[PDB]
Motif scaffolding. Structure first.
Motif: not given
Ligand SMILES: O=C(O)[C@@H]1O[C@@H](O[C@H]2[C@H](O)[C@H](O)[C@H](O[C@H]3[C@H](O)[C@H](O)[C@H](O[C@H]4[C@H](O)[C@H](O)[C@H](O)O[C@H]4C(=O)O)O[C@H]3C(=O)O)O[C@H]2C(=O)O)[C@@H](O)[C@@H](O)[C@@H]1O
Ligand SMILES: O=C(O)[C@@H]1O[C@@H](O[C@H]2[C@H](O)[C@H](O)[C@H](O[C@H]3[C@H](O)[C@H](O)[C@H](O[C@H]4[C@H](O)[C@H](O)[C@H](O)O[C@H]4C(=O)O)O[C@H]3C(=O)O)O[C@H]2C(=O)O)[C@@H](O)[C@@H](O)[C@@H]1O
Lengths: 379, 380
Positions: A35, A93-94, A103, A367-369, B73-77, B94
């Motif tokens: 990840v 988002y502007e 990020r 999950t990648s959170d 999909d968070s579970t995918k790399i 946006y």
């Protein structure tokens, strides 16, 4: 583990098991590394990547739009904006730093933790790249203030409510402690970052906006103090952590928790079950720091006897069954946010009913959170 | 008589009449609208080509947006393939400038086109034409006549046409282009180029695999597809086709979507069912503005299976009085104001005075800058 904004107990345990060679954690840490790869390739973000400048004409100034304030159609120029609690104006988002601090914060946080766990220099090198560019760079680093956070077009007075945006890059600040001692994080990198953090801390404590936000009567005041602890823990100011918990955080819980354990200030919002949780999330992230120096914010009473565990108690039935929530909640409540919350509060309190529910709700193993990295225990 | 177009031609004609005669209420109101219109005169023409991230064709004149309900999909790399969360707009939408840019273009051109029609001031046609040329026909900045990459979904293999619904944002501006015909600013060359663009866009929507699919859709997409189809056909003066699409397509589709109680079962299964019930009828409302100008009333004409669109207004009328009584899934609050224009349109069409009265009672704000309300002085 060094003092920082994370569950240090879970982090040490993961570092142990990965170093011992335990297969389960090694499998899990190798997934995290797959990840984390995008953060190594990711280009460092900067608050200066914006066209529309703040009133200061300084691109190094952080600026976002307050999310619930909309152009007023009945005015010729739409000014002054008007508030619709709970409805996010897509004009947010502007402002590139709104998403870019998430990020960046995600990138540096994940890299810093994986560096702590694996000892691999490639992660410290990547984290340090992000930390230099966002914070300290003489052209790309953000100025240490939040003067123009959650600005509102047409508003006459200056507010401190935007300071809550700081949580997105302040967790990455603390994680910088984890790469100290790598070859990539030089003494000069640390001094500049220490100097920025000291300057950002001063602004939080002495600007009119920082002062106002320190006195906010709702989850803003709690989140202000959680951010404050991340800055102070980064600067290794442990006595100030002790003072902030006793002179600010605990009075704030004592005032904001009612005799039944509800949070009246959050109940009057259009997203009252989200904002009740969001106040407790401030306490959760603050406690991760206070408990590392022996102060447990879940069970430590404010001067009137109230304890933050009362607020979890009040919400726990609705975490089992969100549809039972009887107050205004104009969007669906994501029950997954209760998992980490109930696990954090459950272990702090020895409340196994809470810990059991956290695991049942659970987090997706793959999950990648990035905020879920420490919680294999939930996966 | 107003040229055929995507607007209540009765209200527009009334406004031009009163404005020319000098009636005070209308003249004051048009003077408000002219003040609101001033930003569109200074506004720089937008183009779909103003994007960093290119579509699979690597052609920036191709319109591309992200389908609003598809999230990584968070579970995918790699996050791929995206997954659907119905009703929850992914803020990644946006990152495609044309999503909001087609809205800004369409509002600006529509307002300018209506104001030129009402007042005859050349400065409004000249501004409208600047936006129309830049968006539609310009050889570098004009969009390609297709919607291939509208509401794309990352990682999805099949090609979908559901993104065609985006066309409604600029296709009304296409229709209003007819109103500036005859100005000095809109030359024969401008009209010919736009006619060619519209003809080619019509070909795309009728013959591409995505257009064909979308024309067959069983929900509000099929209604919006035909409402858009009518605007392009009315812009092109193909009135016989408008009759055929009304008779062979919109009414059969409308009748197949209305249940025996007047509910719209396709919209009832959505997470925003009262929004999507209203969105379905708004497609018919706007198509009816074109059909009724040639004598086909879509509100009162029954389909051959017996269903008639007034039945769907009946089912929804109580919940327009009291939206909280709505018993189906609605994961964001419902805007009662959307009922104002809807109930007046269907009300005047059906001779239903209860509907017209509620329209005025709910009303629109007199001074609002929402360009779709320009014709509705009666509601302000
Ligand atoms: O960043 C996000 O999009 C979003 O942030 C989190 O919600 C934040 C919002 O960013 C925003 O700051 C909002 O502030 C509210 C809040 O109620 C605040 O106390 C203040 O209220 C003003 C207001 O004028 C009221 O009318 C009243 O008079 O009180 C005032 C006061 O001074 O207390 O400002 C408003 C506002 O500006 O709308 O809510 C924040 C919050 O409550 O935390 C959060 O939703 C997060 O999940 C999300 O990411
Ligand atoms: O752009 C907006 O934000 C928004 O647009 C309008 O809503 C549109 C959406 O843009 C989107 O296309 C969505 O489409 C749904 C719909 O259900 C559609 O029929 C199709 O559904 C597919 C899908 O595969 C389903 O999972 C199911 O199997 O049925 C299929 C089918 O063809 O029936 O695509 C989905 C999807 O991909 O999300 O809803 C649209 C709509 O209902 O018109 C509108 O809300 C507007 O106000 C707003 O501006």
């Amino acid at each position: 583990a060094p003092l920082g904004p994370f569950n240090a107990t879970l982090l040490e345990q993961l570092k142990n098991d990965y170093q011992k060679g335990e297969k389960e954690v090694t499998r899990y840490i190798e997934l995290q590394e797959k990840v984390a790869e995008k953060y190594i390739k990711m280009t460092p973000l900067s608050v200066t990547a914006k066209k529309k400048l703040p009133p200061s004409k300084d691109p190094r100034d952080y600026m976002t739009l307050s999310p619930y304030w909309w152009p007023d159609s009945t005015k010729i120029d739409g000014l002054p904006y008007i508030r619709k609690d709970g409805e996010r104006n897509p004009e947010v988002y502007e402002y590139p730093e709104r998403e870019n601090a998430n990020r960046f914060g995600d990138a540096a946080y994940c890299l810093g933790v994986l560096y702590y766990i694996t000892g691999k220099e490639v992660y410290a090198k990547a984290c340090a790249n992000h930390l230099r560019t966002w914070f300290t760079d003489p052209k790309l680093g953000m100025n240490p203030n939040m003067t123009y956070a959650q600005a509102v077009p047409g508003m006459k007075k200056m507010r401190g409510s935007g300071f809550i945006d700081s949580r997105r890059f302040s967790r990455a600040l603390g994680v910088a402690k984890l790469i100290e001692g790598s070859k990539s994080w030089t003494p000069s990198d640390k001094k500049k970052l220490d100097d920025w953090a000291t300057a950002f801390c001063y602004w939080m404590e002495n600007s009119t906006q920082g002062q106002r936000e320190s006195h906010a009567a709702n989850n803003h005041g709690l989140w202000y103090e959680a951010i404050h602890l991340m800055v102070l823990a980064y600067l290794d100011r442990t006595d100030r952590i002790r003072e902030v918990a006793e002179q600010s955080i605990l009075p704030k819980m004592g005032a904001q928790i009612a005799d039944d354990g509800s949070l009246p200030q959050e109940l009057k919002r259009t997203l009252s079950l989200h904002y009740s949780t969001f106040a407790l999330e401030a306490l959760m992230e603050a406690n991760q720091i206070t408990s590392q120096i022996g102060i447990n914010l879940w069970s430590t009473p404010a001067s009137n006897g109230k304890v933050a565990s009362q607020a979890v108690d009040y919400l726990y039935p609705f975490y089992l069954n969100p549809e039972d929530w009887k107050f205004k909640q104009i969007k669906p409540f994501d029950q997954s946010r209760a998992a980490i919350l109930l696990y954090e509060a459950g272990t702090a309190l020895g409340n196994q009913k809470y810990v059991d529910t956290a695991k049942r709700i659970g987090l997706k193993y793959s999950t990648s959170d990035v905020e879920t990295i420490p919680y294999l225990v939930l996966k």
